[PDB]
Amino acid sequence: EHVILLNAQGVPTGTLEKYAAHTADTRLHLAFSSWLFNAKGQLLVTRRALSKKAWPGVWTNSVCGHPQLGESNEDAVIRRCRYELGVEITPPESIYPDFRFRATDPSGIVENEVCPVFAARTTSALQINDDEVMDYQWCDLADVLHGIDATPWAFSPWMVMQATNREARKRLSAFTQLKL
Amino acid sequence: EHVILLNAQGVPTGTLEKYAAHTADTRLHLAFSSWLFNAKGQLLVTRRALSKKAWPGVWTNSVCGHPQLGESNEDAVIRRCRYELGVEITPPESIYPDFRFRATDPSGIVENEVCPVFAARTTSALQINDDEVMDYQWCDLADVLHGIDATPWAFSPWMVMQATNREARKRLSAFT
Ligand SMILES: *[C@](C)(CO)CCOP(=O)(O)OP(=O)(O)O
Ligand SMILES: *[C@](C)(CO)CCOP(=O)(O)OP(=O)(O)O
Ligand SMILES: [Mg+2]
Ligand SMILES: [Mg+2]
Ligand SMILES: [Mn+2]
Ligand SMILES: [Mn+2]
């Protein structure tokens, strides 16, 4: 697996081994983040496995990853949902295409990414992948947004930043409608 | 270091090495939970090191531990405050004396404890033991309670049980 390196603009310049790319001096690369809702409109919240190199054991939104060479960001979203959560989804919607984030995790690992955000509905049961996800919960979005407001330091920083973007937040809200 | 096994009633009946004691089948034993506030009235919330056997990486109340044979609850608290957080504290005060619980962590490790709950104020700066704590936050109790009320899953299960105990919540709410 690899990440796609971006120059000091969002322009691709090559690729780099995933593990080797994420260090204390991570270079800009392409990634995605997705927010998954069940038919009932509940949000799927997940907890990263203790073996994740970056933010292990942290509560975060549904699914994040790294598109590979020749992969649309949307295909990447479909793929990691399958791999991490075993789950089938509706076409991912772009809800924050310009999100960009750089940050250091509790042990020094840096994520530095161009990270378009999507939302989608699940259309199958989950088959959680324990090497990726150690715990999860189906929640009402309102509650989650209330927890993020009260104790943001208890969740991944990128979950908080995306959730507090006004336009992104309105998209999340729309997905709380019950859909059969 | 050990934990103290307790029969149905809270009678000590023997001990076990501390590491060997927490398994998928953890047996009932003695413990404590403690909530610490500084002079400004802020609550210390901590995140357990990734190496802890039970609930590693989980956000929780300030300091928890296992009294040893012959040790008072108040001394255990003082001991673990010093050990985990390098902090001196005022005499621990009772806030939930009959708390008890059993729970299972994401890897299937169980805690099963008689666990009286205390509160105290810090009288020195923290000096962190990263074998025990990987992160922490000084915050307002009120916000922490909102967090616990909104997304209980984001916190340890016993933290949630304690804070939502009507009496214990009133007593913590007075440390600010
Ligand atoms: C950015 C959002 C990291 O915060 C993308 C990384 O997601 P991650 O799940 O860590 O990547 P994978 O390991 O490919 O799933
Ligand atoms: C119960 C509340 C939690 O398992 C008491 C145990 O505290 P813990 O921090 O796990 O014990 P130590 O490892 O002795 O610090
Ligand atoms: Mg991922
Ligand atoms: Mg402890
Ligand atoms: Mn990355
Ligand atoms: Mn124990």
Q: Which residue has the tokens 């967090």?
A: B147
Indicate if ligand 1 lies below 6 Å from the C-beta of A74: no
* Residues within 5 A (CB) of ion ligand 3: A 64-65
**Cβ within 8 Å, pair B59-A137:** no
**B88 catalytically annotated:** no
Q: How near does any CA of chain A get to the CA of B47, in Å?
A: 9
Whole-angstrom Cα distance, residue B30 to residue B113? 6
Total length of chain B: 176
Indicate if ligand 1 lies below 6 Å from the C-beta of A80: yes
Residue A123 pairs in a beta bridge with: none
Indicate if ligand 1 lies below 6 Å from the C-beta of A3: no
Residue-by-residue DSSP string for chain A: -EEEEE-SSS-EEEEEEHHHH-STTPPPEE-EEEEEE-TT--EEEEEE-TT-SSSTT-EE-SEEE-PPTT--HHHHHHHHHHHHH---BPPPEEEETT-EEEEE-TTS-EEEEE--EEEEEB-S-----TTTEEEEEEE-HHHHHHHHHH-GGGB-HHHHHHHTSHHHHHHHHHTTS---
User: In the numeric block, which tokens belong to residue A125?
Assistant: 């049961």
Phi–psi pair at B30, nearest 5 degrees? -85, 140
Among B122, B86, B128, B101, CA closest to B32: B101
Q: How far is CA A144 from the centre of its chain?
A: 15
Task: Give the C-alpha distances (Å, rounded to integers) separating A119 from A8, A87, A101, B141.
Answer: 27, 14, 18, 33
Interface of B with A (CB under 8 A): 45, 47, 50, 56-59, 106-107, 134-135, 137, 139, 143-144, 146-147, 150-151, 153-155
Whole-angstrom Cα distance, residue B30 to residue B23? 15
Task: Give the C-alpha distances (Å, rounded to integers) separating A120 from A36, A62, A94, A138.
Answer: 5, 10, 9, 14
Task: Give the C-alpha distances (Å, rounded to integers) separating A159 from A28, A34, B161.
Answer: 19, 10, 26
**B81 catalytically annotated:** no
Please check whether residue A118 is in contact with residue A75, taking contact to mean a CB–CB distance below 8 angstroms.
Answer: no
Q: First and final CA of chain A: distance in angstroms? A: 36
Whole-angstrom Cα distance, residue B154 to residue A144? 10
Q: How far is CA B112 from the centre of its chain?
A: 13
Q: How near does any CA of chain B get to the CA of A143, in Å?
A: 5
Q: Which residue has the tokens 């901590």?
A: B46
Task: Give the C-alpha distances (Å, rounded to integers) separating A122 from A89, A98, A116, A157, A175.
Answer: 4, 24, 19, 24, 11
As a whole number of Å, the CA-based R_g of chain A is 15
Enumerate the domain spans of chain B: 1-176
Task: Give the C-alpha distances (Å, rounded to integers) separating A58 from A94, A174, A179, B155.
Answer: 24, 26, 29, 11
Whole-angstrom Cα distance, residue A120 to residue A82? 13
Indicate if ligand 1 lies below 6 Å from the C-beta of A116: no
Work out whether strand A110-114 and strand A29-30 pair parallel, antiparallel, or are unpaired. parallel
Total length of chain A: 180
How many beta-carbon pairs below 8 A join chains A and B?
60
Whole-angstrom Cα distance, residue A46 to residue A80? 13
Looking at beta carbons, which pairs linking A68-76 to residues 24 or more positions away fall under 8 Å? A68/A1, A68/A2, A68/A4, A69/A2, A69/A4, A69/A15, A73/A30, A73/A32, A73/A116, A73/A118, A74/A118, A76/A32
For A13, residues 6+ apart whose C-beta sits below 8 A from its C-beta are A5, A6, A7
User: In the numeric block, which tokens belong to residue B80?
Assistant: 């673990």
Among A25, A39, A31, CA closest to A2: A31
The CA A18 to ligand 1 mean position distance, Å, reads 10
Whole-angstrom Cα distance, residue A104 to residue A3? 18
Tell whether the torsion through CA atoms of B14, B17, B18 and B19 is positive or negative. Answer: negative
As a whole number of Å, the CA-based R_g of chain B is 15
Query: Residue A14 is which amino acid?
Result: G
Superfamily grouping for domain A1-180: Nucleoside Triphosphate Pyrophosphohydrolase (3.90.79.10)
Which of B64, B96, B113 to mutate to test ligand 2, by most ligand atoms within 8 A of the CB atom? B64
**Cβ within 8 Å, pair B150-A144:** yes
Pick the CATH number of B1-176 from 3.40.640.10, 3.90.79.10, 3.40.1050.10, 3.40.50.300: 3.90.79.10
Whole-angstrom Cα distance, residue B135 to residue A139? 25
Please check whether residue A47 is in contact with residue A155, taking contact to mean a CB–CB distance below 8 angstroms.
Answer: no
CB under 6 Å to ligand 2: residues?
A: B 31, 33, 54, 64-66, 80, 111, 113, 115, 158
Query: Residue B114 is which amino acid?
Result: V
Whole-angstrom Cα distance, residue A21 to residue A112? 10
Please check whether residue A54 is in contact with residue A102, taking contact to mean a CB–CB distance below 8 angstroms.
Answer: no
- Resolution given for this structure, in angstroms: 2.0
User: In the numeric block, which tokens belong to residue B15?
Assistant: 């001990």
Residue nearest ligand 2's atom 4 by CA:
B111
Q: Which residue has the tokens 């056997």?
A: B53
Query: Residue A83 is which amino acid?
Result: Y
Residue-by-residue DSSP string for chain B: -EEEEE-SSS-EEEEEEHHHH-STTPPPEE-EEEEEE-TT-PEEEEEE-TT-SSSTT-EESSEEE-PPTT--HHHHHHHHHHHHH---BPPPEEEETT-EEEEE-TTS-EEEEE--EEEEEB-S-----TTTEEEEEEE-HHHHHHHHHH-GGGB-HHHHHHHTSHHHHHHHTT--
